[PDB]
Structure 1
Amino acid sequence: QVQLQESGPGLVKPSETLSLTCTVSGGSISNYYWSWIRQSPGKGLEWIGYISDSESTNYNPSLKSRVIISVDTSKNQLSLKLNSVTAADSAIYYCARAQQGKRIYGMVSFGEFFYYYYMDVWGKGTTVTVSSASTKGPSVFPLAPSGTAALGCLVKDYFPEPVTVSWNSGALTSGVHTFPAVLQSSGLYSLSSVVTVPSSSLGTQTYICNVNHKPSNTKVDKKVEP
């Protein structure tokens, strides 16, 4: 019923206001609590901050000095702004709905209680990289095949992560296998996607490789044939 979807730049220069947004689909926004969470490589999960249903904010003292959380009730969009970003700020930033629970141990009249917050429905994550380097679109080359066989799609020399890959504009879904990237010493990732299809389908089921790299708005296509 309620799902969340993040959206970000993908690349932000050092010492610059990073900005993210997150869309709620199904429920409203001004009647729940929401949390921003980022996860760096190696370091564990980190709670950035949260915003109430009454649009009140509270920041982790870790990054309290430079994080601003917002909300737009016109639709279901809440944003996040973090300035003075460094290299250690690149991470997957998640978006989730915080639920307020009241733990009562003593008497509520004496205030012997405390509030805890927990995220029950999360987004999917938006990859954000902090680097002085400039963006670059990929270069998609076909990989022709030869009980069954397999064909590929070589997505090389792009920056930064990620790159979505679909076959036949989303039609071909069975037997698809997209492989993690490779950071070459030149500083660019290189991906590869391959599907395993029946041998007889070579003539002539058209196999269209779809590749998208949003940080450079450089979508491309390419067919494969012996």
Structure 2
Amino acid sequence: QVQLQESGPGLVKPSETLSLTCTVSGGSISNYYWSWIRQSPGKGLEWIGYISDSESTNYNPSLKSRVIISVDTSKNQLSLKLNSVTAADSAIYYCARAQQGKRIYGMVSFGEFFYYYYMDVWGKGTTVTVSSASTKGPSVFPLAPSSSTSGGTAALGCLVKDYFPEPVTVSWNSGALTSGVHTFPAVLQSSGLYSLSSVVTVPSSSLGTQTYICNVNHKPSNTKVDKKVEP
């Protein structure tokens, strides 16, 4: 019953300060504790540190130079800023929700424990890499049906070619349809830009003209684009 989503504006220049916040709509956050983790393709997951309602902080050995994270009480959520990012810090990051248990090898006073920190429910995640690139919006072209296999079924999709990161909405008719959906993640090019395609399977009796509209967004470019496809 506790939920997630993380907000990255995009990619900030080298030798600079990150900004990411991940809001939660579940309950009271001054009662528990939500950390960070990092996926990076071609390398393993890694966890980096945390802090408390009673403000007791911690960093990760390789990374403690300039990670600092302080969180707000009015807005129940966390706010992480770094300084001086390299190309390597390119990654999707999940705000990670840590539930603590005790353990103990015996009886408290003696000394008697490390505490483990295990992590319940986290977020879909928001994507941020890093390179010195600006912002531009995609290209929007329609690729009509074939007139595919025997009726019923046929095919049709939208093309989006030249856009800054792959992570872009592409809804159809504001999500009115989800049957037969398959949006392909894109292919990187020598020019340096993802190029995606996304297609739904239709029947030839379904034809034709019942207002299929392809709806794509992209925030760093702040572009809102729909495009009407037709044979």
TM category (shorter chain) comes to over 0.9
**Which residue in 1 is equivalent to 2:156?**
151
Q: TM (normalized to structure 2)?
A: 0.94
- 1:16 alignment partner, SS class: coil
Matches of 1:89 and 1:120, distance apart in 2: 24
- 2:205 alignment partner, SS class: helix
Matches of 1:24 and 1:120, distance apart in 2: 14
2:152–2:205 Cα contact (<8 Å) kept: no
Matches of 2:121 and 2:36, distance apart in 1: 12
Matches of 1:32 and 1:165, distance apart in 2: 35
Displacement after TM superposition at 1:200 (Å): 2.2
Displacement after TM superposition at 1:169 (Å): 1.0
2:143–2:229 Cα contact (<8 Å) kept: yes
Structure 1 gaps of 5+ residues are none
Matches of 1:143 and 1:56, distance apart in 2: 56
Higher strand share: 1
Matches of 1:161 and 1:225, distance apart in 2: 25
- 1:62 alignment partner, SS class: helix
- 2:114 alignment partner, SS class: strand
1:160–1:215 Cα contact (<8 Å) kept: no
- 2:210 alignment partner, SS class: coil
Displacement after TM superposition at 1:52 (Å): 2.0
- 1:109 alignment partner, SS class: helix
Displacement after TM superposition at 1:56 (Å): 2.3
Displacement after TM superposition at 1:137 (Å): 1.0
1:16–1:83 Cα contact (<8 Å) kept: yes
The 10-residue stretch of structure 1 (84-93 or 1-10) with the greater mean CA deviation from structure 2: 1-10
CA shift in 2, pair 1:217/1:153, >3 Å: same
Displacement after TM superposition at 1:152 (Å): 0.6
Matches of 1:37 and 1:53, distance apart in 2: 19
Displacement after TM superposition at 1:161 (Å): 2.8
Structure 2 gaps of 5+ residues are 146-150
Give deviations 1:120-166, integer Å, cap 9, x for gaps. Answer: 01011110021011122111111211921111110111112311211
2:37–2:48 Cα contact (<8 Å) kept: yes
Matches of 2:140 and 2:116, distance apart in 1: 49
**Which residue in 2 is equivalent to 1:77?**
77
Displacement after TM superposition at 1:198 (Å): 2.0
- Aligned positions of 1:52-131 closer than 5 A: 52-131=52-131
Please give the root-mean-square deviation of Cα atoms over the aligned residues, in Å: 1.3
1:95–1:124 Cα contact (<8 Å) kept: no
Q: TM (normalized to structure 1)?
A: 0.96
Displacement after TM superposition at 1:204 (Å): 2.2
1:7–1:20 Cα contact (<8 Å) kept: yes
Displacement after TM superposition at 1:106 (Å): 2.0
- 2:115 alignment partner, SS class: strand
Aligned residues: 226
1:4–1:25 Cα contact (<8 Å) kept: yes
2:166–2:185 Cα contact (<8 Å) kept: no
Give deviations 1:2-61, integer Å, cap 9, x for gaps. Answer: 011111022111111011001011112111111111111111111021222323221112
